């Protein structure tokens, strides 16, 4: 389109930022990827939220049902219930698109974690880029806060259990402020007439602006600080090997966007999530006896669970037991965002890093991730107490118990037996430096001796025996099948050969393409 | 340069963009050099059919849609059945029509666009000395050209209006 | 503050020479390398699997919104009407009588109350509404409802003259 | 704070960019704020609405009232009357902020009329800016529409009134669609149990969203396509002359805020806007005299008062008379985005122009607004019928003929008087060009006769008179005073006297310093 793109050009002339953004290079390791999954899950999360707006009634006035589903005509509800009802039963395609944002949610949240655990472990989070690990912490927490909020809105029993039970009664045991807080919040005592409409502001507007710019400054502080990079052939401090944007990286991109849009369209389709209608609507007299919050909070849960009562009543006062949950969970937060000045402190390196470390050459910091997953893990396990002492047969005490010691035996175990893998790990990648890589074969040596007949990676001595090569932080060879030894199978399609030319022809040239990019990666 | 730089064709163009931007492209390889095959032929008709699966199945879901059975109709006289299977029929449809189509473009991709790599220049660190003394020089003649350093009455009495306003 | 006057170099207009010509390459050789001009099939395949995506998409998007103006839902001595032809003020089984209430203002028993021909004089105008005695004063909440749905209907006022 | 500006220098040296946006360089005319009073005015709404929105109900179930305002104690209404009645009387502060955010909208609709009359009338929207003039027509339509489903949304006696009437009652008359889109917007008949929720959603989050989309991309292109300018001295269609940003336009443009803050406090303070508890809860059986929608939908309202019933009935169906106000507007909202084509097009001058024009310059254009603005003014008095006739004692039927015979016969006399006014200041400037500026002083030259002593403003020529300058699209001077003439007032400070050579050194300092500027400025 000639005309259009030179009349752009006069009265814009970009030609040149365009050029500067369409040669970028951006490195491919399938471990960088979990940040555009959380990214799509959010689109979509915005995109069905704002569908679902369009019916939802935020009100906690009480009226009669009187709808479609029949086992509930005639009970008296809240207007926000009722709402939600015939989203489900009387709008064509609704119940999908929530069970759609649902899922969604869930994704964001385990796909925001993954990201964290490869952040953490592979150690992107030094010199250059503290704060914008800052930023992803604080994009956490308002994303499990968000999540709480969103589905405590169709107010049905369990969401009100789990609003009356954490928000009312943990906000209500503060040691001073307490009972001011409550009050400020929910406009009185607990079941108010505010609260609903409120959340449902909360929700729908606050929090996703807020995540919007924080997400628009993480990705724009990634693009200007270039990506890093595993050490490798090519790589250095100084440089991105990769591939450039303008043909192949939207293209990649785009494709991981249509196939995560298929997986949440898929499970959202066939798996059945929050059914509120075989629910109530919420009523202070009556309970169920699973009370469990989606499994982002099932740790904030778990640690109320197998928390032992301790109190404190002193001259006309009174310090609950959950008050302990409080501080444990502002704990987590702050130590959560502060790690990396401590570990600069701690190790006193205070270098420009952009090469990534591989987890194994790392073992302490290792070893306290694997002890926070495992604490993170009992937390969470702790908090399905009755379904695992239902379903698999175990008394429910002794459950609650052996979260409750497991919370400070499992930790140090994690620690001691990641630190001696991680070593181990080191040696099995020394040992291979050393000598050559182990084929597998044996051979007998007229005078009965077995040898087992290695493959050198380098260059040999005068006697046959290979020379110990360095370690330079790249992972090794340690199967004989992934270097090229057993390959080129025929060229048919599956049942019918191809002629003998093409196979031959198609053999060499695929040789010599891989020969010559090998070369020339190596020689710059 | 100059005004010759036409009559240059299109392989020294795209490395003097490369070289202006610091990129410098090494090994840019075809994936077929030989012409026609079999091979060729089937890889296409493959990357096509889930294409073709795609886009059936989209209009499978929009049919679906508007002629399924969607009403509320659970009882225990007349068991539905129908009603029970009308969202698991719209995912079904919907997610399956959109992974195919995220399939074959991951196919297209990893079998006929071109291999490559590529190296950035990272020129990371402090700015150059111009421009830190430069914006420095600037920012401080800004400030001390005010002679606000000097009006110390001045000063505090907006600290303190701006303080008690807040 | 010191007075000062400045001068910016605009430097407007189409880009150099150079510029264009290497974006414009780099674009043209990303396109041609991918060889996707020389392959109908593909290219034809994936423009339909797209727009029947997308269409269906968008239908699916916009599908529980609309409704049909026309269907009989409103139940009447002929059978079932649409909303837009019924008043209020049209019988329900053939020979039912409607008063033409009047409003109080006050909520002790009655919202609605008849009336008779000699409480008006020549130069007055009132307000109706439909009563249906069947519908009671406004005590219980069953009535309580069907009254304030009586009041708020946007065809059931009258005026009488 | 050298070591936390050097850290952020090694994490980030921008230290090149900063420096490419501290000299920016941009021009100074009064008239180059009307927009910044629209983007304040913007951003104190969004202030004003996230304080608001922590206490609206958006319901319309009905409740009994039962509050602290005592006329309508046992009245029974919705819940949106209830929750703004509680902002009004059981917030501390709540009246204010309201009152706040009804003149801030107020402002916002204003100042951007005001802009558009400046950027029509200067030519600012030619070659290089006819798409930022397209996204500028695009946020004054959305401004209308948000500012009409805000003040719907508490819904009482007026509100309900035109939601009635202009939404249902306009919407249901299309031709084929008609009916449809009224039950796909309201769910069903016009009273309905959606309404105000969907309003409420559309009002805080789906609107506000594009209108910020759109400020963001509007300002990119004023910052990356730099200001236009008029002619004068030192100007060309090459340069911009003007101030940096780094000490003085920073610091005015900041006043400026602060100063709008403040009379927009003041007169939400002190002036009283949509008193709702005078009027109502909507109730579809009583209405009263006045109506009328905020002055900028007074033109829609006004052009369906003044619109003759013209109606259509033809084989089973009817072509209702508000068809009629629906294609004027339709026609109204297309023509004012497609104006810089339809200019280009009649005048065929396709060039870059980065100088502005005076408006009396260019007649033709001036008289076509002139004419404009003197319809919208005929439409926007033809909507307070009622207020006029009964203030102004004169009949009705007399103003609804009075507007519909303007509606004919004013743009044209408009264009008329405007088309000769502009030539006549063409020929006034011409005038004082040709000859010097008049002084005022009369003298009688021995032989009777009086001459009026012009004062010449370029060389003069062997008997004295002046030699005719040529224009170049600047202001000239007309009183003798704006030239310095008579000026140097004493230097005290009101009524004490300060010393001579204090008085001597600081005129003359500020003699010799004006003339360096001017100096300055001619050579460049
Ligand atoms: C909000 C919600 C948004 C949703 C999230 C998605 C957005 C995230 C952004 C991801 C990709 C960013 C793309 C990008 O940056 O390209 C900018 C790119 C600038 O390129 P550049 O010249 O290399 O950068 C400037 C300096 O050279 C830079 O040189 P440097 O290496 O020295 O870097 C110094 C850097 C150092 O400072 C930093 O690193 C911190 C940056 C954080 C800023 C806060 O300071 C900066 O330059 C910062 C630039 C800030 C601009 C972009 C930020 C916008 C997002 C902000 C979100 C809210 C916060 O602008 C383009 O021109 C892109 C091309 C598109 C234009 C096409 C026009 C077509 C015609 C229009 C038709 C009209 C209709
Ligand atoms: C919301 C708005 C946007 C949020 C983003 C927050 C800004 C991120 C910058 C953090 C940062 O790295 O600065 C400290 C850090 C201190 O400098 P350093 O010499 O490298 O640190 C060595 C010493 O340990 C000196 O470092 P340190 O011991 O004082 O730092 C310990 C750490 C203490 O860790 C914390 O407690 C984080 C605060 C969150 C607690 C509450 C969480 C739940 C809410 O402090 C911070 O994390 C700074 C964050 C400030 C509050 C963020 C919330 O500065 C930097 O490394 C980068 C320079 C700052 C970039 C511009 C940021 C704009 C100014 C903020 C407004
Ligand atoms: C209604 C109800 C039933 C469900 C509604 C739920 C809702 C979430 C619908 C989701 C629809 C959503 C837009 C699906 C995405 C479709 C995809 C992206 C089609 C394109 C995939 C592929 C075949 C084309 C190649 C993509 C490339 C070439 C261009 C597009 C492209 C995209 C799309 C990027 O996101 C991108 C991001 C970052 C860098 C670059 C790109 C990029 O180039
Ligand atoms: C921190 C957290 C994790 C702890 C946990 C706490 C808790 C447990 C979790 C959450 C619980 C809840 C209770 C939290 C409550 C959060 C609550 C919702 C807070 C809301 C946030 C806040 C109050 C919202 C209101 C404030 C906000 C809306 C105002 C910001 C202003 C907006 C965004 C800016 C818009 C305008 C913008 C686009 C333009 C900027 C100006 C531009 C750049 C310069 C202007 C300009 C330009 C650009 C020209 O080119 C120009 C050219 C020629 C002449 C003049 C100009 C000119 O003036
Ligand atoms: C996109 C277009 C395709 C939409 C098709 C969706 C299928 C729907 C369907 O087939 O239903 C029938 C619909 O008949 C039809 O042929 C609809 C054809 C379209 C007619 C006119 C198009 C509507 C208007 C809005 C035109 C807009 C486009 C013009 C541009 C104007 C500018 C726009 C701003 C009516 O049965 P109904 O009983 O009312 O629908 C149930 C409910 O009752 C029940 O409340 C339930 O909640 C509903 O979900 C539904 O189940
Ligand atoms: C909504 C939450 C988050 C989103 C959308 C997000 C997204 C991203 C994306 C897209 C990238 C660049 C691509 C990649 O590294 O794969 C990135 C990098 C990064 N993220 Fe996150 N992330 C989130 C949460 C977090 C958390 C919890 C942390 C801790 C964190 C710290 C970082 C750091 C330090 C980088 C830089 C990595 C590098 O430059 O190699 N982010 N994030
Ligand atoms: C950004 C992160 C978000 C998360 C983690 C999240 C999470 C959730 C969850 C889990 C539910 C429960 C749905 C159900 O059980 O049926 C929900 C409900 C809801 N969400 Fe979100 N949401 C997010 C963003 C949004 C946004 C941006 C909007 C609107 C613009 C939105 C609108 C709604 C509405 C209206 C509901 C209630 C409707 C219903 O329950 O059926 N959400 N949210
Ligand atoms: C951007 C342009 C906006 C315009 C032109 C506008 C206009 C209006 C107007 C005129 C009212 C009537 C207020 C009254 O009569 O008491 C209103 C109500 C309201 N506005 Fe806005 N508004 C805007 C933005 C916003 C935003 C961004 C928010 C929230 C984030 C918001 C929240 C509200 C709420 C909650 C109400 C109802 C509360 C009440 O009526 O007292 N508005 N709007
Ligand atoms: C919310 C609506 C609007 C806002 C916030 C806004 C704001 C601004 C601002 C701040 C400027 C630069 C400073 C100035 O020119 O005084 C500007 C310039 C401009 N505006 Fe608007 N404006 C709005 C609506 C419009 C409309 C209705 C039109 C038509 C329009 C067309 C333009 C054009 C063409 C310019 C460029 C003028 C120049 O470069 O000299 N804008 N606008
Ligand atoms: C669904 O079924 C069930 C059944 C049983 N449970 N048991 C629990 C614990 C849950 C559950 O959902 N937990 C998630 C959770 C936990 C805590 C909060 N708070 C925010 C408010 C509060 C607070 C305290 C102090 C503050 O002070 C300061 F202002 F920050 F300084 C501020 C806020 C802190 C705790 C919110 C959500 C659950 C669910
Ligand atoms: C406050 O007290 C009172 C008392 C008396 N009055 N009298 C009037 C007229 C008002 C009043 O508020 N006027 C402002 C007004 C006017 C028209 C609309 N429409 C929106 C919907 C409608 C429409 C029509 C066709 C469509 O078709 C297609 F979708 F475009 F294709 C779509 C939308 C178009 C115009 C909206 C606001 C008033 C107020």
């Not at chain 2, 492209?25 to 095959?37: F, L, M, Q």
Request: proline fraction near 6%; include cysteine; aromatic fraction near 12%.
């Amino acid at each position: 389109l000639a005309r259009q793109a030179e009349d752009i050009d006069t009265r814009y002339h970009p030609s040149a930022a365009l050029r500067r953004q369409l040669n970028k290079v951006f490195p491919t390791h399938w471990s960088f990827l979990l940040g555009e999954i959380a990214l799509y899950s959010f689109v979509v999360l915005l995109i069905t939220g704002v569908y679902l707006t369009l019916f939802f009634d935020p009100s906690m006035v009480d009226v009669t049902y009187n709808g479609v589903y029949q086992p509930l005509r005639g009970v008296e509800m809240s207007r926000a219930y009722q709402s939600a009802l015939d989203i489900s039963f009387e709008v064509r395609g609704g119940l999908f698109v929530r069970q759609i944002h649902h899922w969604a949610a869930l994704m964001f949240a385990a796909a925001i974690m993954v990201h964290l655990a490869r952040i953490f472990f592979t150690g992107a989070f030094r010199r250059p880029r503290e704060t914008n690990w800052v930023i992803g912490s604080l994009l956490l927490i308002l994303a499990m806060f968000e999540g709480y909020f969103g589905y405590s809105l169709p107010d049905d029993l369990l969401s009100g259990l789990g609003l009356r039970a954490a928000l009312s009664s943990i906000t209500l045991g503060m040691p001073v402020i307490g009972t001011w807080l409550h009050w400020a919040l929910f406009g009185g005592d607990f079941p108010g007439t505010i609260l609903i409409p409120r959340l449902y502001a909360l929700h729908i507007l606050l929090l996703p602006g807020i995540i919007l710019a924080l997400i628009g400054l993480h990705l724009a502080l990634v693009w200007f600080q270039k990506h890093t990079q595993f050490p490798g052939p090519g790589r250095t401090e100084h440089n991105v090997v990769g591939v450039r944007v303008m043909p192949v990286f939207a293209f990649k991109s785009g494709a991981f966007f249509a196939a995560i849009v298929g997986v949440l369209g898929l499970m959202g389709g066939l798996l059945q999530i929050n059914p509120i209608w075989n629910l109530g609507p919420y009523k202070p007299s009556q309970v169920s006896a699973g009370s469990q919050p989606d499994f982002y909070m099932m740790w904030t849960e778990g640690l109320a669970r197998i928390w032992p009562p301790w109190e404190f009543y002193f001259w006309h006062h009174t310090i609950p037991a959950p008050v302990w949950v409080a501080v444990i969970m502002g704990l987590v937060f702050v130590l959560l965002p502060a790690y990396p000045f401590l570990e600069k402190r701690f190790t006193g390196d205070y270098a420009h890093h952009n090469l990534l470390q591989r987890p194994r050459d790392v073992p302490v910091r290792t070893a306290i991730g694997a002890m926070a997953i495992a604490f993170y893990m009992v937390l969470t396990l702790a908090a399905m107490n009755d379904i695992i002492a239902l379903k698999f047969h175990i008394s429910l005490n002794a459950t609650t118990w052996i979260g409750r010691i497991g919370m400070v035996i499992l930790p140090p175990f994690v620690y001691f037996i990641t630190y001696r893998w991680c070593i181990g790990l080191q040696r099995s990648d020394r040992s291979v430096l050393e000598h050559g890589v182990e084929t597998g074969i044996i051979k007998r040596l007229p005078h009965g001796a077995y040898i087992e007949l290695h493959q050198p990676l380098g260059p040999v001595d005068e006697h046959g025996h290979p020379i110990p090569l360095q370690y330079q932080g790249a992972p090794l060879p340690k199967r004989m099948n992934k270097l090229g030894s057993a390959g080129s199978p025929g060229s048919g399609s599956f049942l019918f050969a191809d002629s003998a030319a093409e196979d031959a022809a198609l053999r060499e040239a695929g040789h010599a393409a891989e020969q010559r990019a090998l070369a020339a990666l190596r020689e710059h | 340069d100059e005004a010759a730089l036409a009559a240059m064709s299109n392989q020294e163009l795209l490395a003097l963009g490369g070289k202006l931007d610091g990129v410098r492209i090494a090994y840019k390889e075809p994936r077929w050099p030989v012409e026609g095959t079999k091979a060729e032929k089937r890889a296409e008709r493959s990357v096509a059919v889930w294409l073709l699966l795609g886009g059936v199945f989209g209009l499978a879901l929009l049919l679906i849609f508007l002629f399924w059975p969607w009403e509320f109709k659970a009882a225990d006289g007349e068991s539905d059945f129908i009603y029970s299977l009308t969202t698991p029929l719209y995912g079904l449809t919907f997610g399956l029509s959109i992974l195919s189509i995220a399939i074959g473009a991951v196919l297209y991709q990893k079998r006929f666009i071109p291999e490559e790599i590529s190296i950035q220049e990272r020129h990371d660190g402090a700015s150059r000395e111009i421009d830190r003394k430069t914006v420095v020089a600037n920012l401080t003649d800004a400030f001390e050209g005010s002679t606000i350093r000097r009006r110390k009455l001045i000063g505090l009495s907006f600290g303190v209006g701006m303080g008690a306003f807040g | 503050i010191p007075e000062e006057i400045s001068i910016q170099e605009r430097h407007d207009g189409a880009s150099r020479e150079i510029d264009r010509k290497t974006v414009v390459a780099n674009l043209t050789d990303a396109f041609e390398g991918s060889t996707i001009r020389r392959r109908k099939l593909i290219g034809l395949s994936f423009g339909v699997g797209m727009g029947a995506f997308g269409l269906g998409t968008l239908v699916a998007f916009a599908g529980g919104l609309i409704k049909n103006p026309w269907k009989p839902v409103v139940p009447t001595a002929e059978g079932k009407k649409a909303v837009l032809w019924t008043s209020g003020w049209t019988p329900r089984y053939q020979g039912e009588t409607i008063y033409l209430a009047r409003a109080t203002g006050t909520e002790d028993g009655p919202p609605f109350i008849k009336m008779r021909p000699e409480d008006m004089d020549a130069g007055g105008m009132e307000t109706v509404f439909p009563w249906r005695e069947s519908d009671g004063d406004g005590t219980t909440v069953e009535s309580h409802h069907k009254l304030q749905e009586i009041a708020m209907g946007i065809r059931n006022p009258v005026m009488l003259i």
